[PDB]
Amino acid sequence: MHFFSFKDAMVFAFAPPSVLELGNATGFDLFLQDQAGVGHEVLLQARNKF
Amino acid sequence: CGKSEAPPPAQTPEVGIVTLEAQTVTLNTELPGRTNAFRIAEVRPQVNGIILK
Incomplete structure (x- = not known):
């Protein structure tokens, strides 16, 4: 990870958790849903705001 | 503890650069086409009768 701070690609490497049946990376997870029916641009700018 | x-x-990270400069280019296209003869003459008769030879 200290060697992969190079120019062209955004390479971001890691290790799996102890139980590989539970995902592939650690941490949390959430979804930001669009229940109003307003378009994809508003949801995308809401995610970029988040 | 510590x-x-x-x-x-x-950090002010590194980027990759190229230095562009002026350069002449020729713009040329390629279009399909057919070949035609210079002169075509369809030999059509000007009288009436049977071809003997």
């Missing part, structure tokens, strides 16, 4: 280990914040 174990803080603050990294250096200021």
Whole structure:
């Protein structure tokens, strides 16, 4: 990870958790849903705001 | 206790550059087409009768 701070690609490497049946990376997870029916641009700018 | 280990914040990272300059280019297209003869003469008769030879 200290060697992969190079120019062209955004390479971001890691290790799996102890139980590989539970995902592939650690941490949390959430979804930001669009229940109003307003378009994809508003949801995308809401995610970029988040 | 300790174990803080603050990294250096200021980096100003590296980018890749090229230095473009003026250059002449020729713009040329390629269109389909057919070949035609210079003169075509369809031999059509000007009288009436049977071809003997």
